[PDB]
């Protein structure tokens, strides 16, 4: 899919944010949206075609593939990258609205966070952090962080137990670890950014 | 398909609309057209190929797949997103026409909704609301909001009853719930926007 | 295929046409070219692969698929949208030529249809109307407006009669009805536009 | 393939050519390059996959498909549209070179075909005409203008005679007739353009 | 693949090169990069799928297809078009560097090849010529300029000799001849260009 | 995938870097990102489909294909081209920040590496070199630089030993050698660039 919608929006916020916001925008840009279109989208290509279980009964393969995979991981990461990118837009909307109000009000005759922009900023960073830890918790709860080559399936209308074999488990586990460590360092960067901003705000 | 037709049209209306109109345009932009191209278009890929019923008779699979699915859900959502996006264009057309008439008439020597723009605005929001509830009612009438893995098919030229097995029911039900809740909060946002505008119009 | 050839041409005519011409250009833009790329192009994907007749003889399927379908409907609509879009270009060419001649002639020292532009306008609308009714008549003559799921085929080198089963008849009939009603309201809009223009031309 | 190479070149010649050159550029633009990307490129999709002959011998199908088709028609039309578009570029190159020489020479202190531009113009139109009739003659010599559904193949390593069945003969014959009549009216337009230009050149 | 990297680079050299350089850039533009994306990329589509040898042993087909084809021809032409396009970039780099040095040095208070630009020019043309004849020599050494329909394969783990049948030999031989004659006239154009430039350089 | 993210970033650094940095940016541009989209992405197309081992047991092919290939080479090169392109961005970020600070500070009333830019420059080149040699060492440790046509597989649930046959080993080994020699000359260029810069820095 095309990812040139947000760019004409995240570029405009890359004019009047702090340096930690700029480097977080840069890592979100170059390490997630770029990685998702390039290679990790190709690896999930032959998802259901190469999947195979050892039986002769018709239609058991679809049920076992369903029970193994509630969702593919790519659409999970896309929902994650949508939900971590909503709650920073309203900060841009608020500063754009108050800049418009400033340019309206001053003519009846820089950037400095004061008054309420601190509040919007900290609740935006808090929402980003809690969405991050929520998505990571859900991914650990459902899938874990390893994929075995052999799966045991125990669902109707198949007989008692069947064995199924995936396709490319190693590469997928590698990319799962990679997206995990990217999410981890993004959370750590947000935490140290909020810590530095609060320290400078109590220092001034 | 390409979705860069309307953008050169919905951008121009994102200059002189109210804030509720701006946030509704933003959610229609980022949560529907972006979601439709990215991931939910991929999941309906192997629609008819992976579909399978348990028989030996030729050609029964096409009839049972037809009787199960009158339309795919993606084309239904595309028709929905067309019909909720027509009746806001004529508001832009009317304000563009009267702005042209203003710029023609004033030289023979902002934005403020007065006279008839209230009427066009409220009938546009009313048409959007009734189209929304009509599409949601039709989707509840035909499909429901859950998909069973096993379907029973009872059509000629197949014998009496046959069983059919779909592909990925869980992920599709998840995305159905997701589009449902997006439509619900869009309707609620339109209702509270019209309520606020009528309250300010009787307040002034 | 790419549809960004005409746009740099139909945009230029969307500067100096009447309001009925503008709304006809808008409906031709948003309801045909947009609909053709998005969803109805996907539904004709597995056209010949899913087609199947009940025999054991090799090669009968191609002959029966040929006799059922002289052309696919999508290429028929593309030829229709080409032939309804040629005879409006020469109006733009004529007004561009006479505007160039005006800008050449005036310097040797708006828009108002006078002299011959009425003639070009009415013959353009007449050609559009007769091409519309010709294409609709041909589509009714060959295909009708419904598709049965079962077809009886009676051609060599197959034996006497064979039965064939299509793929997704319901969705295709829905989209056929949709393109029909779009063509109908386009013809009605052109007729009422010409009626209004002739009434204003005899009123003045 | 992408067809946005020549456009940044045929647009520049659509500033200082005659009206017959402009309408020939317009028909070459809208009726060939647009038609080739949109629909007629889709119809040649399942070219070799759906092709089938009635035997049990391995590998005969490739030899019979080769002997039936020296080239597909689409690549033949692409070579035709390249060879009819080369010998008009050097006219633009010559007028650009002499316009550069004019702008160099005049400062040491419109368009009017005089001197040698007549010669370049008539040899360009002559080369376009002879390439057109050469390509049409070759297409009539090899293929004819009709496709039978059944073909008889008589090549080693197949036994004596075999029968082969194509895919969609009717639609392909329709598009062959269409490209033929487009080429015919292009040749007639070039001839009447050269006739009018020579008549005006002997009239002056 | 996308070929809009070099264009923003070969366009800039199409401002200050000689006329033979301009026509060589034009033929390299319109007859190679355009031809490679359009049609000849489609013909190598079903490369390995339609390939077939007559045996019952598993896996022999991959070994015989490997021994027949060290590389496909398209990737060979892509490497050729990279290696004939590197050694002209440094000429642009040198003239850009010395133009920058001129614009730096003159303000401390056209194009004319003098001093060392002759040397860079002749070694660039020499490198282009020797790379051209090297690639053509290698292509004649490995493949020849004709493809038989039947191939005899003599490799382990297949038994003694097997026969293999290609797909579309005639069309591929046609395009091989076409790329050959394009390379030949490019080499001849470079030779006559260098001859004319040296003749004018000894004439002055 | 799209590779037009970094371009709007590596272009901006191609304004104020040294000549060795410019030619390294040029070779990274034209010989890696261009080569990866064009041809070497096509050759890894039928990766798992054409792979085949000689057995009758179900599902052994996926396990043997997994044990042969931990990752495909293309995604390995993509991770390499990401990790060699991160540690040059912060140099641009630092010079942009200090140029902004210069333009802020000077108004309270070229490029010359002094103070700390030397330090950032040498640690950037050092990080690029060590990442290059690390990736090359890992590729030599896992794969080697040759691919045999026949592989012996010794994993459960297959019986004792099985033989597997790849697809196109020769072309893949050629491209492996090609990417190897490109990486080698990139490392050598970085080394001689740092040597020249340190020699000029101790010369001044």
From Swiss-Prot, chains A, B, C, D, E, F:
Species: Homo sapiens (Human)
Ranges per topology, Extracellular: 44-75, 143-173
Keyword DNA-binding among record annotations: no
GO molecular function, one term: gap junction channel activity
Assigned protein family: Belongs to the connexin family. Alpha-type (group II) subfamily.
Tissue-wise expression: Expressed at intercalated disks in the heart (at protein level). Expressed in the fetal cochlea.
Phosphoserine sites (modified residues): 4
Function: Gap junction protein that acts as a regulator of bladder capacity. A gap junction consists of a cluster of closely packed pairs of transmembrane channels, the connexons, through which materials of low MW diffuse from one cell to a neighboring cell. May play a critical role in the physiology of hearing by participating in the recycling of potassium to the cochlear endolymph. Negative regulator of bladder functional capacity: acts by enhancing intercellular electrical and chemical transmission, thus sensitizing bladder muscles to cholinergic neural stimuli and causing them to contract.
Annotated disorder: Oculodentodigital dysplasia: A disease characterized by a typical facial appearance and variable involvement of the eyes, dentition, and fingers. Characteristic facial features include a narrow, pinched nose with hypoplastic alae nasi, prominent columella and thin anteverted nares together with a narrow nasal bridge, and prominent epicanthic folds giving the impression of hypertelorism. The teeth are usually small and carious. Typical eye findings include microphthalmia and microcornea.
Its membrane topology: Multi-pass membrane protein
Keywords noted in UniProt: Acetylation, Cataract, Cell junction, Cell membrane, Disease variant, Disulfide bond, Endoplasmic reticulum, Gap junction, Hypotrichosis, Isopeptide bond, Membrane, Palmoplantar keratoderma, Phosphoprotein, S-nitrosylation, Transmembrane, Transmembrane helix, Ubl conjugation
Gene: GJA1
GO cellular component terms, A-Z: apical plasma membrane; cell junction; cell-cell contact zone; connexin complex; cytoplasm; endoplasmic reticulum membrane; focal adhesion; gap junction
Subunit composition and interactions: A connexon is composed of a hexamer of connexins. Interacts (via C-terminus) with TJP1. Interacts (via C-terminus) with SRC (via SH3 domain). Interacts (not ubiquitinated) with UBQLN4 (via UBA domain). Interacts with SGSM3 and CNST. Interacts with RIC1/CIP150. Interacts with CSNK1D. Interacts with NOV. Interacts with TMEM65. Interacts with ANK3/ANKG and PKP2.
Positions on the Cytoplasmic side per record topology: 1-22
Subcellular location: Cell membrane; Cell junction, Gap junction; Endoplasmic reticulum
Protein name: Gap junction alpha-1 protein
Disulfide cysteine pairs (residue numbers): 53-158, 153-164
Variant or mutagenesis effect after changing residue 85 to Y: In ODDD; de novo mutation found in a sporadic case
Superkingdom of source: Eukaryota
PTM text: Sumoylated with SUMO1, SUMO2 and SUMO3, which may regulate the level of functional Cx43 gap junctions at the plasma membrane. May be desumoylated by SENP1 or SENP2.
Biological-process GO terms, alphabetical: atrial cardiac muscle cell action potential; bone development; bone remodeling; cardiac conduction system development; cell communication by electrical coupling; cell communication by electrical coupling involved in cardiac conduction; cell-cell signaling; cellular response to amyloid-beta
Effect listed in the UniProt record for changing residue 7 to V: In PPKCA1; can form functional gap junctions; results in enhanced hemichannel activity that causes increased cell death
Crosslink site: Glycyl lysine isopeptide (Lys-Gly) (interchain with G-Cter in SUMO): 110, 203
Residues spanning the membrane: 23-43, 76-96, 122-142, 174-194
